[PDB]
């Protein structure tokens, strides 16, 4: 079959390569069984705002990504750099969970390269962002019919926020050339305004 003929002449002919097949599937992962509280940032009480996003360093963990799907419908599970699945076979050194609450139409801006209002003044992701963004609607846990104004966000800032930077300052903005020197009035708009969730 390697010569494509039903009759072979006299001589030596190379046909294939004797490659020994594997036997076992040794893993040899580190010695870690402490299932750290990965549910403390997913199923907890009220969530952080965008200008004060909570950044929890998670190390010495057993990252079981098969526990965030049996919960409420998690949408837009977009991993940049890795696949959504096949995350249960990789050993990371230390991960960071940045938790906050945004609007429905503002979920697109949480992505490398995308710009807007939340991705430029509240939380910016770098172009080499090797992580996963996970969003889910909370209209039953973060909304009530009374007028919901317990979530703040920044609208005005001098320059664009650099990737992985938390801006919790309260310096007044100046939309014009008038030296407001801290009065919060005409052309001195407050930099942090509240949301409206009905």
């Amino acid at each position: 079959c390697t010569l494509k003929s039903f009759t072979v002449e006299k001589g030596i002919y190379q046909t294939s390569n004797f490659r020994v097949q594997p036997t076992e599937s040794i893993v040899r992962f580190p010695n870690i069984t402490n299932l750290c509280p990965f549910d403390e940032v997913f199923n907890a009480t009220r969530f952080a705002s965008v200008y004060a996003w909570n950044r929890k360093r998670i190390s010495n963990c057993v990252a079981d990504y098969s526990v965030l799907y049996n919960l409420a419908p998690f949408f837009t599970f977009k991993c940049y750099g890795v696949s959504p699945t096949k995350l249960n076979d990789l050993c990371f050194t230390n991960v960071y969970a940045d938790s906050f609450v945004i609007r429905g139409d503002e979920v697109r801006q949480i992505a490398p390269g995308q710009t807007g209002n939340i991705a430029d003044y509240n939380y910016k992701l770098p172009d080499d962002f090797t992580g996963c963004v996970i969003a889910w609607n909370s209209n039953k846990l973060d909304s009530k019919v009374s007028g919901n104004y317990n979530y703040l966000y920044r609208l005005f800032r001098k320059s664009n926020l650099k990737p992985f930077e938390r801006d919790i300052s309260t310096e007044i903005y100046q939309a014009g050339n008038k030296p407001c020197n801290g009065v919060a009035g005409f052309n001195c708009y407050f930099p942090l305004r509240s949301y409206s969730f009905r």
Partner: nanobody
Amino acid sequence: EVQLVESGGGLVQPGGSLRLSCAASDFYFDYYEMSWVRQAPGQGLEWVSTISGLGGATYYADSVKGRFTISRDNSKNTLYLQMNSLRAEDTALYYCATRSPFGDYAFSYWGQGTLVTVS
């Protein structure tokens, strides 16, 4: 702060017409400038058209040059939007935003906005 509302239609056939009206009051409008800014479902923001208060010169977007025209009524302090030849890919929630020309590129106030879908 001070903020007002905008009304109009909520659905229009692909080929009809619609008259959107952003109603403002108790504001220094004649020296300010107004503009409409749309938002496609699943996309970002896009500047549709703008009018000034100083000279009243209008500026439209390159995609809506011959399909959208606006006019500000200073007697009623409202902004009109008469859309012509509505296609199927122009569905977006239009926001009514006013800003001062002697400032920065950031919108001062944002309207309520309403989504108008086309069949």
